[PDB]
Amino acid sequence: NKYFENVSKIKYEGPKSNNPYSFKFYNPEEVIDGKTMEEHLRFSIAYWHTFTADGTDQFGKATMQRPWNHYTDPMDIAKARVEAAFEFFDKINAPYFCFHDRDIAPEGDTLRETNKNLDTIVAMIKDYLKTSKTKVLWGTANLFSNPRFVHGASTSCNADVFAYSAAQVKKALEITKELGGENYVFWGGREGYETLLNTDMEFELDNFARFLHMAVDYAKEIGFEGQFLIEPKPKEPTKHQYDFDVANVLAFLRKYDLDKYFKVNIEANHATLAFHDFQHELRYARINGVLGSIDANTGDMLLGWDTDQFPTDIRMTTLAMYEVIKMGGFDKGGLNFDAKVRRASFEPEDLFLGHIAGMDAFAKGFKVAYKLVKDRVFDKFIEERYASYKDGIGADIVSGKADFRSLEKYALERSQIVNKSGRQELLESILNQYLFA
Amino acid sequence: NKYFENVSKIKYEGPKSNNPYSFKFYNPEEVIDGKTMEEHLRFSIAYWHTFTADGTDQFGKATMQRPWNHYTDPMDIAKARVEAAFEFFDKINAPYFCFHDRDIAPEGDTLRETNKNLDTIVAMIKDYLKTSKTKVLWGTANLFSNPRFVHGASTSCNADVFAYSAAQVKKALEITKELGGENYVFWGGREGYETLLNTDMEFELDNFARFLHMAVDYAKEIGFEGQFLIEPKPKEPTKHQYDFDVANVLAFLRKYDLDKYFKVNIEANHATLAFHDFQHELRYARINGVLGSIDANTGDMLLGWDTDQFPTDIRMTTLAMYEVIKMGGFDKGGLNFDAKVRRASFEPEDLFLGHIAGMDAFAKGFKVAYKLVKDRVFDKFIEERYASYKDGIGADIVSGKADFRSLEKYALERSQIVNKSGRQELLESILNQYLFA
Amino acid sequence: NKYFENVSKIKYEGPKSNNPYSFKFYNPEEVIDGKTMEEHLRFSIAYWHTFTADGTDQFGKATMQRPWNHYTDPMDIAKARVEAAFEFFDKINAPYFCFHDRDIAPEGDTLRETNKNLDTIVAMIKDYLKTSKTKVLWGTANLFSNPRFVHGASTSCNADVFAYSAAQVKKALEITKELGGENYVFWGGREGYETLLNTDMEFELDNFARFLHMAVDYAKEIGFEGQFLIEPKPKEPTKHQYDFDVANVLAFLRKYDLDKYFKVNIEANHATLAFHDFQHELRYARINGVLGSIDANTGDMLLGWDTDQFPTDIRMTTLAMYEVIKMGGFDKGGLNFDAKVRRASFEPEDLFLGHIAGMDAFAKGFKVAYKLVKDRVFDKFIEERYASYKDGIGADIVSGKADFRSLEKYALERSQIVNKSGRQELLESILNQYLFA
Amino acid sequence: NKYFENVSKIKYEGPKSNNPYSFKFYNPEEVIDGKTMEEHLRFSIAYWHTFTADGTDQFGKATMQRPWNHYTDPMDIAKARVEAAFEFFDKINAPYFCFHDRDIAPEGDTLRETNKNLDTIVAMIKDYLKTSKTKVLWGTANLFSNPRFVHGASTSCNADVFAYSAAQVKKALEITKELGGENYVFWGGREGYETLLNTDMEFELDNFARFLHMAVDYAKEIGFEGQFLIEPKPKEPTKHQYDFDVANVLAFLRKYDLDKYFKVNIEANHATLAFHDFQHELRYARINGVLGSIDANTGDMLLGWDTDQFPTDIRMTTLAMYEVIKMGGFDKGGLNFDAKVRRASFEPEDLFLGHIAGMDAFAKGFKVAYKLVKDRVFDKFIEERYASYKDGIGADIVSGKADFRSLEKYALERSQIVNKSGRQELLESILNQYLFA
Ligand SMILES: [Co+2]
Ligand SMILES: [Co+2]
Ligand SMILES: [Co+2]
Ligand SMILES: [Co+2]
Ligand SMILES: [Co+2]
Ligand SMILES: [Co+2]
Ligand SMILES: [Co+2]
Ligand SMILES: [Co+2]
């Protein structure tokens, strides 16, 4: 085809294949419990990193070699990207993709012009969607790149920016609905502060809640049925981002009575940046009924910034997928690759190699996690571990019959409390048996 | 007197005094707005670090030289500590002190024996309280040191430990009420997990909530009127402590409908361990109406464990006291020195030198913070900064009149959004003018 | 036998065995390139964690259940541990063990008494050594636990402590030689500072070098031929430990002309605590000819203190063993398990389960690393990657022929510099193919 | 004047001035020990942050409002910056400035064109230098921004990039000499690695040493007499930067026999990023005779990336200046403000406010540090603390008379070792007395 002529459609070839352009573990067609591997995993391509990132970092310029680099007019570039994107979706065999409104079309000098450019590109994507197998997983609004967002979007000290932010999200909800997106994401990149000295924290949090509330009202109004998702990150670019982690978000949603409308999009790199294991954040969201979708990537725990690397640690993908299987699998969410090739991986085909690495790592982890759940390896131990709550004083405690007085009566009468081993080391070695089975 | 013969009562001598045993900045008697410095600050001595810590660390043995070290019988040691404690309170001139039930008396072979020992010591402390000016700020239960708490207290997988924990807290609430404590603290040292592989997170959080609920029921029953406080810490000894930070606690309290009974005790070292500035955690608690009390100390931001050092950074004490003054000052809470002398500061008089350092640093910070609030230095700028919400579209946004449609109408019609500087550098230099005034 | 009656000798049973008391990956008998797996790996048991640690942490008391717990006399306990240790060595099938002088015998009231106790136990260990297959890998002196070391050992401000430290190390070198130890380790636990305000850094570093110099002089004198090793750690218990990381140690050794006598003992948890990957520290030591031995464990990268966990991450053990194989394998060093069971894993058999987990993880990693080296997977790419230095201007650069003038002449004449991809993502996915082969 | 018409020359007005455009603590004219405050401090303006940074970050576009923003031709912009720079130097009253070759002129399509552009601008700066009081502190080469440096400069796997790097540094040394620079700096931004899988570490370190060696040879040849400086940073943009910290650099310089030519330029933010206090890194460099110059700024210890904030913590500036005074003051180095205004501080005058904040903080810290040194506050205590080395066994240890045998003889004969308090808390409170004197 046109943009990636050197790369043919990627196909499954098994763990012993030497072909770099093939899946080693991910077999889209493999059936597990009545669903193909493809529908269990719901892989999604991130439009921003894949088609707009150029290798630029804070200390250097673009390194990425891209076939659509030669166009000078912003609209020609936007159209070329849509073509390249759909060629890519077809070759990588991706069922989904995600985008920011500002990834797909350039801004104009006014909001009207910006919206006209957006309509042109949306119309084009819609034609491709009619003949592509790839669908939109979720859409979102970029409320952080443009200079107007210096002081925040809905948390801006400038009411005009709040007004603009509302207008942009209104448009973004409309195009997400039109393209058939199944979710809509909010990542508050500039929703936080840089210094407490000039910040009215209560006022900003009140406004943030007003904004989110206006967004759910508008979604109902136009009948958008996709799941609303908040994406936590502790910091960067801000010193403190309000949606610090899953718990912070829940504290916020419950206070402002927004908790019945939102779930969370958890990103591995953002979890570890807050000093939580990816699995902790997944588990905590699960038991709170808010594990909505996942941004599949990894950071480096020795680096204190968002690296957005393709995930290749299969021990981590296993522990992650264990949580997804425990909740019954994805509903509307999926595994969105919010990951970018390293600045040194600047050749076009590296886009393919990066995704193959991540898709294989997650496919393998899914298969192992699935055996861990099916064999009830950890669940049996957990049952035996907490068995004292099944009868006796424990049953009274869980049923609401016990209180401080009755428990004291009980406790004065017992002389020896005997505990048993937590078996962490044993549990970890069993995990290895399954990993390398 | 008996235990600290070489040290006489510590008195204010001003910033030019060479006497190491005197306050340089803290004048208990100084009056500011109708209250003495002593009643503004409400300094409290931590019984555990001050009278029981012995310099032991994870790599070495005790270094602390203590006059009550010669006793062999546990009860003789407990009685000697009460004497020494009250001599110390008098000399350091402390209005308050805090304790754990297990700091003041030794455990016996059964809960009954433990409770009898506790009654003996409580009776003794009560006599001293009749003639001392020092009062009890808050009491608490040590639910983390004894081996029975390996798997947690209320989050233990062993129902017998839950029962014991209830019995201990029941007793602790009773003695706190009897000694006239103004608050009661919960620090969940073992309430978290070490590995997710063997943990039923939802079950443990449910039990934690049941426990806390039984505690408020019992407090009402015996008519204990002190404020209940949860003390956040992200980890250590656990890999993840459930009360991770203020937001985590609020998410929890709101979910289980416990939020109307609890406020938080924020410790500086515990805030920075979760990667929040002490001031952030204070501010967040304030705007949520849960800033209850403070554990005055500092950690080292380059060290990833709880150091509990005496606070000597006056820039930090200023920013901390700014928050306390903004909420109208302490109510029932105070500044409890949850700090210990370094292992190398093992001579008796170092106890005095440590406290003088911390009391002076907080007194100075209070005086500066007070001028910052009185002159409305940061508040004027904040007013001007967010002024666009006082009329026009901003007023419509705050009053509930605006929505996505009206805001879009507005936004399409505006062409230029003009922001103004946040002035962080200017704000920081003004802070220095006040600090060094 | 006597101390671990419930546990029989641990034997290899393969990856499909359900028997928790067996090796799943480690087959001592398996031969690879003329050496058994046992002689490639040289596993060592840490005497301190295995026979003296009791579950105590900074917030709680001992949890460990140990058969020799009933003895009251310190010497009876020391003798019982030697018996238990050799029973354990036999059952876990360990070729080596390491110890601190203070692990094996209790101190007396004077150095003479301490040394007499040590002689008694050393004599006993020597008898067991005559009939055991287990040998001493390395010995070391505990210069950090006793209160006298508060201000450091050789870096103490107290000359008497320097004198004592010299005496202790002299004795420790003597008993290590007598027990046939192949190395001798220096871990400077208290060799650092807590505050710069009271520290003469140059003086302490000079004394540290004097001490180390006296130690090599004495080793020569008694003809001790084992390798001297320094063990880096960035901090804890100190705020800054002088032997911060491998590079810090090399800077020190080169300055004081000690570099020809020392190599390093690298511990995984200590490397990550300094914010280096374990592999980085291994590689850096290798290319500097100082990779001497390894303390096989893992920390938790989200926890800022030394956890000393048994290593179970096989991706990490692979990358570690890759470095050891690249240098030609161990010489006198080995894999010493400086790891302890979690406080919650307090039953005797957990000692076995912990070691099995770590031995299996390292055995598996060795086998994979070995295929990575044999197939030259990364080496081929590295050869192609740096090929421009094989001829042309690159050859002139490496041979010493080029200089700034000639290179400028060359550079002005070239118009396009073309780089090629670093292929990180591809390299990581190939690693996975090998891991899960 | 032309570019900053709203700002007049900044003058000292004292701590009680309300004028934001004035020094509160920095009096250039104040004389201390025969030198003005201006010559003690040697303040330098960083050309890159001050005249080329535009508020761009990794998540957003430029926010900075700059009078020279309207030019379209790269050379017109470069000329306008020189004019603005000298207007700025005059108004802020800066004695020095630093620059990268690539800060002052734009690259062309070839190295020849690049060098011609550079000559044009250098000629212009030279005219301004004839009538300005500001001089060049140090120059440096930007070997990290251009795409060619993806894989490193001298550590590039591409020999052509090594050749180019040599050519650029040759030119940079020439223009630094011509502008009268007193030092020349090497910051290895791309000299490190992203993954060990594709890195030949020994080869890259060998080449790095060859490069540095060619640079000193060329400096001698053209008779450049300024001090060569290496600037440490642990990471960013790389995963590991070779010049990790001062100790790493010394290990490297000593191995390749380059240590007699280099000193270090220590940056506060880069020290804390490696988990060293700024003061530790300053002290360590001092006792090794390599404290060459300082980049005066601060990072945020809770943020894991380089923030380059203006320094406003006067407790830190005091501890920093204490080290500089202890070595006898600056020689050829100075205090270069490698700091930038926050993205939210985008108005022109914020450039002035940022520098005033930093200059005042350092001036105040200098004055306090100076009293700390003059009164020998910490030195007296250090003398008393280590006094045991002045005679007896301690004197034998320092003089080379003692050895393991004699020290053992001594140690067996002593029964009690008595240590004294380290007095950390006392020392910290005295620091506060001086700070707030
Ligand atoms: Co990210
Ligand atoms: Co994301
Ligand atoms: Co603490
Ligand atoms: Co506390
Ligand atoms: Co360790
Ligand atoms: Co070790
Ligand atoms: Co920097
Ligand atoms: Co710098």
XYZ file of C-alpha atoms and ligand atoms in Angstrom, chain C residues 233 267 269-270 297 306 308 338, ligand 5:
9
model
C 24.760 0.767 49.553
C 23.425 -6.537 46.003
C 18.317 -4.175 46.497
C 21.279 -1.858 47.177
C 17.810 -10.700 46.241
C 16.115 -2.316 52.046
C 15.903 -8.039 51.152
C 21.064 -11.960 51.347
Co 19.993 -5.391 51.628
